[PDB]
Symmetry: C4
Subunit: 501 residues, 4 copies
């Protein structure tokens, strides 16, 4: 799983496990018990303020048993954290384990022993010990970080407000702690003067009502909603309210920061697309191009990228050989399945040439190949129609699953015909050097291309002396296999039928 990936492969993980055997943190038992320990810690942290407010006056079996269970869980956690191994345990104890173990203790037994050998003072001491027992927050945060690293990155694509709920729960816990403190401070001093407790007679009211009022001001101060009293009668109340206001301000600022971070991270793709389009349009405006140019460029950009951005060259370069090769194989399955030359050929040659193609998109009406120009690349029509024109020869059309541009790459001359796009056509270009290097060691493909090129040129009417001489030399050569000749004839017939259509 995650531990195996972080360690190495299966062999490395097995070797590490054998070395450990001959208790480590990356163990299934610990990786399952940490959740139970965190749940127990959360329950204890939620119940301790309630017990402090209740002052343990009626700590009956339902509460005493819960406190004992929490203390036992904390003791077990400390014992597990205590455990080459002796030195590590000593270092952990000297660093942080001793403090956590001291914080994890059944203070109820200590209080009972002290009383066996000031009831309000005893209750205050017990409450202070219970509050100090909540020092497991560091371990809880470490476990939460481990869980986030192990599970939050497993999908990370639900598009849900989970982190928002995380800060919501954190703020709720902070507000609960603030209310507990603001209720215990009058209780710690027993509230002699007319503070809020005597102002609203909350002591004579139900415990739920007093908790509601305390939480009410806790939330009001922690939030930026000031429903607070004009002022306080006592002396320490002002200072604890400053403390509450400070922690609430910090919590609200962190809340706003997390919210804006999430908002910025949410709309990232739209942000980069808008940035790129404004960038290109602003560059185009720098040169003061006509508005028609602006519209045409915008149309091209909107039609090539479907409102999307990607460094296709960079991403394809990053990937390894088989993944990239098979991605290319899948992306052009229609091309390889349609054009008969690819099917009746070595698949090694097919993938070797396919690995060098490049995506291109052409607007309708735009000239692709002009007669008389110098040629530098092939063109495979992946999708869309195209037109081939030449004076005194009418015109013809090429559909999907075909190709052009082989004459100049073969004879090293100049472009003969002219090629236009009658629609938004998506083609695959192949550079002259890549084509030559792929085709040089595969003479069968060269012979087939020469034959189909001769057929097409005879269809047009012009005759290339170099291509004719090459064909004559090939015929005079020993490469005259009957099966190869039949395959070439079938390919030529299919190409002629497609060109006629």
């Amino acid at each position: 799983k995650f531990s195996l990936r972080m360690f190495g492969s299966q062999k490395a993980v097995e070797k590490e496990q054998e070395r450990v055997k001959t208790i480590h943190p990356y163990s299934d038992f610990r990786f399952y018990w940490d959740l139970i320990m965190l749940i127990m810690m959360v329950g204890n942290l939620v119940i301790i303020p309630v017990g402090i407010t209740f002052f343990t006056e009626q700590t009956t079996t339902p509460w005493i048993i819960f406190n004992v269970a929490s203390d036992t869980v904390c003791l077990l956690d400390l014992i597990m954290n205590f455990r080459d191994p002796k030195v590590i345990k000593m270092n952990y104890l000297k660093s942080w384990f001793v403090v956590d173990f001291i914080s994890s203790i059944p203070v109820d037994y200590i209080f009972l022993i002290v009383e066996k050998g000031r009831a309000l003072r005893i209750v205050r001491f017990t409450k202070i010990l219970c509050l100090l027992r909540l020092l497991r927050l560091s371990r809880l945060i470490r476990y939460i970080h481990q869980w986030e690293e192990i599970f939050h990155m497993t999908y990370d694509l639900a598009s849900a407000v989970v982190r928002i709920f995380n800060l919501i729960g954190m703020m709720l816990l902070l507000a609960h702690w603030d209310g507990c403190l603001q209720f215990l401070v009058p209780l710690l001093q027993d509230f002699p003067p007319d503070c809020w407790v005597s102002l609203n007679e909350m002591v004579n009211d139900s415990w739920g009502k007093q908790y509601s009022y305390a939480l009410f001001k806790a939330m009001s101060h922690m939030l930026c909603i000031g429903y607070g009293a004009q002022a306080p009668v006592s002396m320490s109340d002002l200072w604890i309210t400053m403390l509450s206001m400070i922690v609430g301000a910090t919590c609200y600022a962190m809340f706003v920061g997390h919210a804006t971070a999430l908002i910025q991270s949410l709309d990232s793709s739209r942000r980069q697309y808008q940035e790129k389009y404004k960038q290109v349009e602003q560059y185009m405006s720098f040169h003061k191009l006509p508005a028609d140019m602006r519209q045409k460029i915008h149309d091209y950009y909107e039609h090539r990228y479907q409102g999307k951005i990607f460094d296709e060259e960079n991403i394809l370069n990053e990937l390894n050989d088989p993944l990239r090769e098979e991605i290319v194989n899948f992306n052009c399955r229609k091309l390889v399945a349609t054009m008969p030359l690819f099917a009746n050929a070595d698949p090694n040659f097919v993938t070797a040439m396919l690995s060098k193609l490049r995506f291109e998109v052409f607007q309708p009406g735009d000239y692709i190949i002009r007669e008389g120009a110098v040629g530098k690349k092939m063109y495979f029509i992946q999708h869309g129609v195209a037109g081939v024109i030449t004076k005194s020869s009418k015109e013809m059309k090429l559909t999907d699953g075909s190709y052009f541009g082989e004459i100049c790459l073969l004879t090293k001359g100049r472009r003969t015909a002219s090629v236009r796009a009658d629609t938004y056509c998506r083609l695959y270009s192949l550079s002259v050097d890549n084509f030559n290097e792929v085709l040089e060691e595969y003479p069968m493909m060269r012979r087939a291309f020469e034959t189909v090129a001769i057929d097409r040129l005879d269809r047009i009417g012009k005759k290339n002396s170099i291509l004719l001489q090459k064909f004559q030399k090939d015929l005079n050569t020993g490469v005259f296999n009957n099966q190869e000749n039949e395959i070439l004839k079938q390919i030529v017939k299919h190409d002629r039928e497609m060109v006629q259509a």
Copy 2:
């Protein structure tokens, strides 16, 4: 349109439509009816709290008819969403369609049937059913997202606060819902004790006044403006106010996040320009350059980029062949129209060479070409004046639509004269290898360049043996066309006249 672009080309869209025919979401009927459905849903969501506040005591024809129309619209929407096709419909029903259909029901008929077979309880049940009928928020959000994807990206350049109005409307709707809840909660319990309703006697007041007060506290709590009561008398009022404060805090945080995201996205271009300029100035300060150097570099940067940034190389590389080629053709229309050699030549050659130019800008007084140095590029003066100097030959000037640097690229020797810039001159450079590869297969351009170079060198006085030998060989060669000779003579005369000026 957008659906056609997302699907493919016209042929692909037609094939998909034929396959569907032989009800799909990308249909004009649905793409027009979704707006009406969303408008009806918004009207229902705005009217339901009003009816809940009114408790349906006077649900006369104007309100009963509106409720019936909303129920009919919801039923029609559910029926349309219900509809290979049977399996898809079953999956949609099992996933979300069943819940929406249950939420879209005329609960008034059910209430009437129940009463036919506790008036306050009946009113409360009707209000609860009406509130639950607002579960079409998911479909409304989906339609809003579809509309944003279809229309907000169509222009995306109005520089107007439209998203700001979006969150403003969202906050207004949230405040309306909060006020409806805060008014119905006393109504749900009938408000026995002295809550706010008995405190201000809002029941005896007009419905508009009570709505205003409820919305007043709803907005006060939803905002971070605490005008709330010191505290509440009842028990549930505190809890519902905690809920209101929480939702208001979340809404305000999201508002602030969206606002800062929009602010950051607004000033993006200035941000990147400032970052780039501070980057370059900080690098320059790292080497501890003199302040005069700082001023000169800042002037160059401010004059090359007109306070703008663009990866011209990257953007030009991304574009396809025809768009980039025609952009280059337009950007140098003055150059091709002015210099007589370009006009009386094959346009294929013109664009082939033009495709390889590079923009350059030179400060006044800066040396561009120094005598005796080794040359590596051409220079086409697109705009600005330049000076040509050489000892014992006075000096001359070159205006726009001219060029220099051909001697070294032709004879493969060293720079003869010296070239200075008397103003901020914008030139077009052409590398030696690109120039040689473009010019090698077009011997007419080479002959014309050789002739004009010989004329210029004779004007200076120095004679190049290699160039003279090449000219003599060309004269002895068979390329002695009368039209070509006349064109070369006219070009030489024009160049001499320009050099004299």
Copy 3:
């Protein structure tokens, strides 16, 4: 200036001015009068709420004259904005000029004419007309944007809170408008019931006191500081307070957004440096390198970059030929001034080689050149000391302004000696291909390098057959100039003296 740069060069600006002459926005008169117009508009916008509060009851000469001056300024601005030119003026009038001209009118004369042909109604109409006359905010914002584009980018490096003051002034103006509205609304209705005016008897108080109270609640509501009344007695007061709360919330959100944008833009350099260092340290941790490796890499990074970041290659590539060349010339002035070979040589050769150097920094103790290895570059010691060691030859030192690594680049063999760094040394590397291409056409530099190399090798003791044969061929060749021989002898003597030291 800015207009000249935005238009072109001096010639282009002069041509545009001549074409205009044979009133344009890029004119000095308009570019100076816009500031006066904006000042007048600001004064009018600041004085209109004061007059509305005063209800024009005592509009004596000091106020009537100010109103007349503001009206005259607005009329002059409209007249100037009114003015090929007729069509442009008509289009501007149809678009926005007509609305501004209607808003810029002396409504006092219209009111006087109407009265010549309901005193409270007349005062209310005059106040409404004065408020509507403030529609010049669009022109004011356009002028402010023009000023920001013309002046804020002139320096943009004061590190002062100027934009912060901009939003502070905007918020102050918004608060003034809100207070004016909140004071005029009771005045518009004459405040029949016991609103705040009757609550505090502000009417009987001084005008300054009433303005202070109105501004007090305006600022309280516009800010997120709710000192507002528990509730309002009247009916429209609640609605106008909702409007005030909404505008204040929007203003505060925009304030926070601008503040965080400025904060993010302020610490940009530290942010990128921290990002880069965490990036490299995290990569290094990915490979699990020892802590000593971490410290050494951190030391190297902190010593090469002085806590700075810059794409030196990219920035140097962007710059043109003369700027980059002269920057390189200045950066190595110590090198060219110290080493005697550079001074007694063609400066063209000096800059040609200097243009290809690369900065490098080496830690103390790190081996730079190891004996027996294959060499690929030169090294120029710009600063710091270095040690040359070889078995059975003791060792020697090389100070600043020297070089090594020529033996392998000359004889195309293997490294002979070994080179160590005894301190943090900053050197300049020169690749073998660049060195060969620079030195091939400058045989004097090759001869000098060969002579000094022979001297150094004889100092070590080893003799290179290829170098000796080349020296013998050069001696037998015709390049035996007395001045060149004397210069070579002096350079060899200086190199020997430096090597001895």
Copy 4:
């Protein structure tokens, strides 16, 4: 230290120190005394509001001595700041030193002298002078910035909220100043009417109580928690409360901005990783790949990068020669230590080849080398197992510390066998050109590779004519060293044993 790095090397620092000697800011004495000066300034700024509130009525020895010490410290700081050197001192005095010196003066002596030659007026003047003496804030901020530049960047990796505490302290100081002003303003006017002082009788209360109330409203207004009075009775109180509200709003906005900046900077690595993964997945979705493809690509990305991002090529290119070389040497210590050919060879050759390796990772089951294809690179199995298969030869396995792909790179033919990955294998690839250029000048490595290749091919059964001819020529050649032959035989035996296993 930091000054030495900012100046240069040890020699440069020593030269600068000698030049200064033959008082500069980069001195240890000043760099240690600045902290004491800042501590004294902070103490004075904390004590001045307390003395102003106390009105110096009981300025006994504990306070008079503290004031005298603060004045003496300020005078010493001004004297030190006062001190080629005369011109610098004059310029500093004309710029800022004079203002600071005027602000740093013992105003108590001036007041005593004035009284020797209106007790409330004298106290007010003394308080104003004490407030004006706090103008050392500029020097304090400069010292704080220097300390941040010298120490905060030393580690910058504690992951602690130190900047948060910085703004917390800044806000606390601002609140203290605001409370001091809000308490002195009634004291400045002596508070004639019933302001807050007469409202709560704070004058008759203890000084601590009055300070608590003043700080209470200072914090309430500075924060966005409005517990402020409904309104003020006096006239100037409203204006000073506007000032307090403005400064508090600015402080809170800056607090929020710093908080969100820190939040964004904290989660940077996760942000870029999420951006990159969403980018690649979105590109993959653009081509509409099957879900199995999505899962496989996600697995590959998660296994190559351990949830990490790094431009390994860029980072490795940035580093110098020795650091990069030794990093490569450490990263492949297992490879060099395991494979016997590396150990019994020149370490120069080992590092020369190691410098050109490239990391690669392959999924289980993916074909790496297919029979009949054209080869272009080597493969070194750093970790993981691999399988070698060929028809009619069963199959074999290759473990870690081995290599394949030498046949095609040697004979320049085609791949003979086939290679599969049976697990997640991490290999090191070496390009054909780099391998040839490294191996061409080290014929011993070529001979060893040829011998092991012949052994492996004979193990398979196929015989390469070119390799056999090369081996025969090498045997007939003079390279027949007994030690080299024994080493080759041992390497061949080890390779055969490994291949058998």
